[PDB]
């Protein structure tokens, strides 16, 4: 295999997720099979332990191994299914070598950092590059790693000391590395300043890497003194410094390395063996569409933006096979609630405006009662007054929750996940042993538009996360009316899709739809939703 | 509290256990209340994983921690009981905020390198700097820091920003830091070079700590030019600059501290509130005994020094209090061994007249078969020719299967250890559910020589590391003879202490009593062995 | 041309200019045209200004150029003639582009360290290397740079950044870096230590030149541990560490780099196109001569070794071809004068009887009164006793005032040097315009011992440093007598070797003989004094 190492520079926040994506979709575009590996040296070992309103949303794989949002952002450039070992937080190696210790797996001697730690790294990393992360099932070419943190970190120093060494153990015609950097323009003067990129290269080459590749962030391009003073004193070529000014969408990222050469530069520092023809349409069609959409977003997390990264960009993945500039209508659940008409009116107010002034609503998951009350009446609104509606995950439970509350009249119904003490319990804890990562959902009628939407395959494979479903007892009832169980696990024991009949288009589903998305086509639940929204649906089918 | 750091300048092997041991001694010698931290940045929790081949012993404290050596060498000098947390691995420290993080103690956050092992090692630094390590039971007033590696090693990074954070959440009058550094003299010249120094101090100011004291090791004595050009570039006054040469043995550098102020100098800098005469006394003991005693010790890990240390360190503290000038006769059990005669009679021969030329014998421990026919042999020699005998832990169990062996003239008498397959299997694995640290043991007799060195109270508390012991059915038949069991277990359920009536001394102890000996006062075995080598044992009682 | 870069590690004093010079033998004697550059960023412009009490000597060039030690080192291992400025101070760089500046040279720009500075540097290595340093008159291959101080000092960043931009103006197959580190042993342990060259590397890496080849400076060789720890840090293979041990003396040092295999190296990196047998057999000879010569070295600076250093090479150099071990009997002339009987007879009795032991004695130059009657009874004794005797500089001025003291009876004869109020007065301040470097000396006779040394030619070219000379007048009635004046300037102005015919040897010469004297051939005065000394010049003649 060849490896290529991404590395930051003077800050965080430069954008490595961004190039390291770029730098593996240009790859992919050669007709390459690319893999990728983020390295993040926080001491967690995954994600599930992440509170979803302070660093974001968990990512699912199709392993159930809960990851960062990255992995997401790999997945949906490059094109692949990656695996839960292939992000490597410090956490995973120093228990991987503790677990070897206290195993005696090291006779008896002193385990040491640069030894053993350093050590352990190198092989996970040659371990993690040869599996079959392409839907192909072959074994990939070239390894694209990402390192966190920036150089200098006390943190990333295991990892810059283990790629120091792998340099070697691996020959140079198959290792290369790729530094970031800021580039400042102080409004003071003006000028672009190469000072403190200087300074990251002088850090870096000490730690015993050189760049093969500097590419600098800044606002406006650089100029050709400033990539002749880069290339004197960071000893690459003047055309080995790369320039990632702003752009309108990050889709123009794999296009700016295109333009710069950065795809006829590897395939001779590596000795390697279109796609980005799709992607420059795609980049225009973002710029040029005028005609809009909007989308009224209902959840619990919405004083954050990455809380939801995976369903808006789902939301912008369909958008634009709908040909329509996206709205997302924010509203927080707890200010729809009623109990808001106890404190300021005006807010209640405005949540309902926000919601009844949008052409679709869609209810995202995440536990806890917080706001839940302030989704069954965006439900009961969504169902009342027929604007088209997608739930996803508690969305699903919520719909059942309201549809029992108001159409069979059961006025406690709720989920023993808010309140276990009602009469007509409608949602029940029901380990799988929680229902994690890929599994399979069969359809069990040809009626449902959700079937339609899918293609009209007999079943689907879909990634989950959850533990409370609907109760078989009362299942038995709510058949008798307009709501559908559409589809099941494998041998009908848990509800995995419903749907209303009655209505333009209302449907839940246990699984995130958003995982699967892609930038070249949508999955197919939030398609529906867009397709309705703007009326096209019937058209469509 | 107040602390001290010790950390390690231009190469590992400065000396920085004796300096630290050096700082705990002259503080006690105030009547101070000492305690001390051996920070070690390897991946081992524990030293009962090490190979004792390898990395030297493992010493065992009161809990029945198995600990590196540095421990013992702190129990030793300060006269103290430490817990099995004063040794601070690096592993530990990872696995304790692993385990946090895997339960939640972090609630959803990314635990990081800097915000939380960083701080998890300055929490474990308070909490094990203030248990009761003296035998008074109070809580500690000084705690010295040693600090394993040398600055700049990456291993050594998240203990150095540790303390650098660690100096201002403690005020500067309660932590205070000593440097060591390499001093150069290269024979090309003979001038004593500071270079390596600056350097080393520069790279220490620039992880955030700055030296309150350098000390520098050195062949000769520091020169006045050299105190002022280090007072220069470490911003340390040339009183400052303290100086440890090389002396004739460890006894001595306690004294150069005091007689170089260091002393006067923490009693001002940390604004703190004798036993170096006894100490000073003892070290001219040393340089000035001629008189000669040679002990044999039969061990399979004689290809290495500091896989006995104990050992040796208790013998040499029961030589200078019998004033003789100790001989260690290291002879290997597999040389030793009948077998040798089939490749090289030479080497075995040797092994015998390295033997019988000695003025008594000691067996100590260490698990597995090779060469235990060679101490078989050894302990039926000590017996027969009646020169005076110690077994400690296998030195016990081989006595009682020597003595099965050619007394009871049982010619397949073994441990189960060694073959499980015999007749009269005479010592079997026992599970305390290991026998690890600090336990009670009762003497059965009065008439015992070892219950008269324990200064003739009824029982005694030892530390034990075993699995192995006499079985209770054969037992009976043993002490019909001139073996007898002098000390048991708190109800009799295994044996401690066995002891020879027909031989001027010859006996074996389950425990380890070299963990227990200080250079103030030998502990009873080796007293005994060597008062009994020296022939004054019949005087001295 | 073809460059190597010397750079210092851990230490000054590691012995950069014996690898220096071996690395220029081992190359001359591969057939090529080597030159050296001595850089030493300390801020004298030359060495005119040094006093030689503390300094140690001042070596003399062709040009009249008043240069450090460190050229004669190379011109006498080496065999060349070199240039006043292939000595390249830091104060000659800031000298003359501050004279650019000064000129206007820089057209009215900002002049700066890193683009000007840092730029005069490359220029005047590439200037400097050119000119014909052979006396063959080629244009040389190879250039040798030593740089002085050590990595990460102040004064040798200008220097360092110089030769980061200097190996791509020169492509890399034209560039080298040669890079020396200590690598010590400390008695606590004996293990050799690679943690200071860990460092040294990482510094000079980071400041952007890697080691080509790593030399290591140690007592004892190094092990195959050490040189695979030093190859995995340094980033060069097992092969690329070169060992420097201790040795007998310094000609075999040329012999441990070929055995080494670094001449095979830069025939490889540098892809460029014996003598080393004769060096061997030298070095052999050193060791194995036992029978034994002394001479007598009357001179003011001999509290310090180095101000003699030329003189006491030539001397080695002769002993070596007379097949004799040579003693130095250094003897103070402040010690030998009377005036001592005043304050201790014993110190002036001993530095009599060290001149009435020696089989030979020589007076060395340095100019200024004190004890400068003590060689006046020196010479006294030497031409009474009739001991052989050379003088110069000083020593045959000298020379002729004891002749005219004591054989033309003149009580008050002196040097105007000394006094200038006397009667007779012999020798006269008498500028050239200081009489420096290289000039041509007539023979006026054909009886001399002196012309029969130097091969019986008619002149001599040899090297100047004096502005005293034997006045006109008083030259007519010396030559009355046994003191003949053999050679003489151009047209007869200034004498320049004197002789006495009635004495088995007794000489004077103006010049320096030592800086023209080399390891295969001595110059023909301390070949001559050796000769008279051993009584074998009769024999030679
Ligand atoms: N292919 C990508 C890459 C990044 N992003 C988004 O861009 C933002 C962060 O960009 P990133 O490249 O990861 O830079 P930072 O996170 O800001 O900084 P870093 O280099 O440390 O990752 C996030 O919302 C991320 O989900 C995205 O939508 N698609
Ligand atoms: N000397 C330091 C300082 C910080 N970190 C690491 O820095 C990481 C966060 O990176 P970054 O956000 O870039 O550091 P900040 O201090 O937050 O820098 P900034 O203010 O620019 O955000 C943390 O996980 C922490 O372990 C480190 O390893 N060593
Ligand atoms: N109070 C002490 C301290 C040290 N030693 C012994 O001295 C040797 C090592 O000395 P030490 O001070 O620990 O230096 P090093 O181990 O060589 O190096 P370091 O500073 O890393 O510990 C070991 O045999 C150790 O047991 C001893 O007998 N008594
Ligand atoms: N931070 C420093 C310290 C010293 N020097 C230089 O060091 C040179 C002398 O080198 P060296 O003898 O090796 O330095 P010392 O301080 O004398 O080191 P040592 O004690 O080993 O002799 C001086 O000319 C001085 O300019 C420097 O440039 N920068
Ligand atoms: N070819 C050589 C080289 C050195 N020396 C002598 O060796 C001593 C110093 O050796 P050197 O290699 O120059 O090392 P140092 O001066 O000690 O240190 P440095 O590397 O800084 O020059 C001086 O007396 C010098 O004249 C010599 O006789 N012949
Ligand atoms: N860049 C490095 C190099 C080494 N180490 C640490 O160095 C420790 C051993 O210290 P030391 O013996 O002093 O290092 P050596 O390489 O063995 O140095 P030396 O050759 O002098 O023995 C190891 O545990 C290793 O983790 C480190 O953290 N960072
Ligand atoms: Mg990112
Ligand atoms: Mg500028
Ligand atoms: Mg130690
Ligand atoms: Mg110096
Ligand atoms: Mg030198
Ligand atoms: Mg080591």
């Given at each position: 295999m060849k490896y290529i190492l991404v590395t930051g520079g003077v800050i965080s926040g430069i954008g490595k997720g961004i190039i390291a994506s770029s730098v593996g979709t240009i790859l992919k575009s050669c007709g390459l099979h690319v893999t990728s590996i983020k390295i993040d040296p926080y001491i967690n070992i995954?994600?599930?332990?992440?509170?979803?309103?302070?660093?974001?949303?968990?990512?699912?794989?199709?392993?159930?191994?809960?990851?960062?949002?990255?992995?997401?952002?790999?997945?949906?450039?490059?094109?692949?299914?990656?695996?839960?070992?292939?992000?490597?937080?410090?956490?995973?190696?120093?228990?991987?070598?503790?677990?070897?210790?206290?195993?005696?797996?090291?006779?008896?001697?002193?385990?040491?950092?640069?030894?053993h730690i350093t050590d352990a790294i190198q092989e996970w990393v040659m371990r993690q590059a040869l599996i079959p992360v392409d839907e192909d099932g072959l074994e990939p070419q070239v390894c694209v790693i990402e390192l966190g943190g920036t150089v200098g970190d006390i943190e990333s120093m295991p990892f810059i000391e283990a790629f120091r060494q792998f340099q070697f153990k691996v020959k140079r015609e198959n290792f290369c590395n790729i530094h970031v950097s800021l580039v400042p323009q102080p409004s003071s003067t003006?000028?672009?300043?190469?000072?403190?990129?200087?300074?990251?290269?002088?850090?870096?080459?000490?730690?015993?890497?050189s760049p093969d590749l500097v590419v600098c962030r800044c606002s406006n391009p650089?100029?050709?003194?400033?990539?002749?003073?880069?290339?004197?004193?960071?000893?690459?070529?003047?055309?080995?410094?790369?320039?990632?000014?702003?752009?309108?969408?990050?889709?123009?990222?794999?296009?700016?390395?295109?333009?710069?050469?950065?795809?006829?530069?590897?395939?001779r520092r590596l000795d390697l063996p279109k796609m980005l023809m799709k992607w420059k349409e795609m980049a225009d069609r973002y710029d040029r569409l005028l005609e809009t959409c909007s989308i009224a977003l209902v959840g619990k997390y919405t004083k954050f933006s990455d809380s939801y990264a995976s369903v808006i960009k789902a939301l912008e993945h369909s958008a634009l096979a709908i040909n329509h500039k996206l709205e997302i209508k924010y509203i927080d659940s707890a200010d729809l609630e009623?109990?808001?008409?106890?404190?300021?009116?005006?807010?209640?107010?405005?949540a309902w405006q926000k919601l009844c002034s949008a052409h679709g609503v869609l209810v995202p998951g995440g536990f806890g009662v917080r706001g839940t009350e302030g989704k069954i009446q965006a439900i009961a609104w969504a169902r009342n007054q027929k604007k088209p509606f997608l739930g996803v995950c508690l969305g699903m439970q919520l719909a059942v929750v309201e549809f029992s509350r108001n159409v069979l009249g059961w006025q406690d119904a709720?989920?023993?996940?808010?309140?276990?003490?009602?009469?007509?319990?409608?949602?029940?804890?029901?380990?799988?042993?929680?229902?994690?990562?890929?599994?399979?959902?069969?359809?069990?009628?040809?009626?449902?538009?959700?079937?339609?939407?899918?293609?009209?395959?007999?079943?689907?494979?879909?990634?989950?996360?959850?533990?409370?479903?609907?109760?078989?007892?009362?299942?038995?009832?709510?058949?008798?009316?307009?709501?559908?169980?559409?589809?099941?696990?494998?041998?009908?024991?848990?509800?995995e899709i419903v749907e209303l009949e009655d209505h333009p288009f209302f449907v839940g589903v246990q699984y995130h739809p958003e995982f699967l998305s892609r930038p070249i086509k949508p999955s197919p639940p939030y398609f529906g939703l867009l397709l309705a929204s703007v009326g096209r649906l019937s058209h469509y089918l």
């Open positions: 995954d994600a599930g332990t992440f509170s979803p309103y302070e660093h974001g949303e968990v990512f699912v794989l199709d392993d159930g191994g809960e990851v960062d949002l990255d992995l997401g952002n790999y997945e949906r450039f490059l094109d692949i299914r990656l695996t839960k070992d292939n992000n490597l937080t410090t956490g995973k190696i120093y228990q991987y070598v503790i677990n070897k210790e206290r195993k005696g797996d090291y006779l008896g001697k002193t385990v040491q950092v640069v030894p003006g000028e672009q300043k190469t000072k403190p990129t200087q300074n990251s290269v002088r850090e870096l080459r000490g730690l015993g890497l650089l100029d050709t003194s400033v990539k002749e003073k880069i290339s004197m004193f960071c000893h690459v070529e003047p055309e080995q410094v790369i320039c990632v000014h702003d752009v309108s969408s990050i889709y123009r990222v794999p296009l700016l390395l295109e333009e710069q050469g950065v795809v006829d530069y590897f395939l009623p109990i808001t008409s106890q404190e300021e009116p005006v807010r209640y107010h405005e709720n989920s023993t996940e808010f309140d276990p003490t009602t009469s007509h319990p409608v949602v029940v804890d029901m380990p799988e042993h929680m229902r994690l990562g890929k599994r399979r959902t069969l359809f069990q009628t040809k009626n449902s538009v959700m079937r339609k939407l899918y293609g009209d395959a007999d079943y689907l494979e879909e990634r989950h996360r959850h533990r409370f479903e609907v109760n078989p007892v009362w299942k038995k009832c709510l058949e008798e009316q307009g709501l559908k169980f559409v589809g099941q696990d494998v041998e009908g024991e848990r509800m």
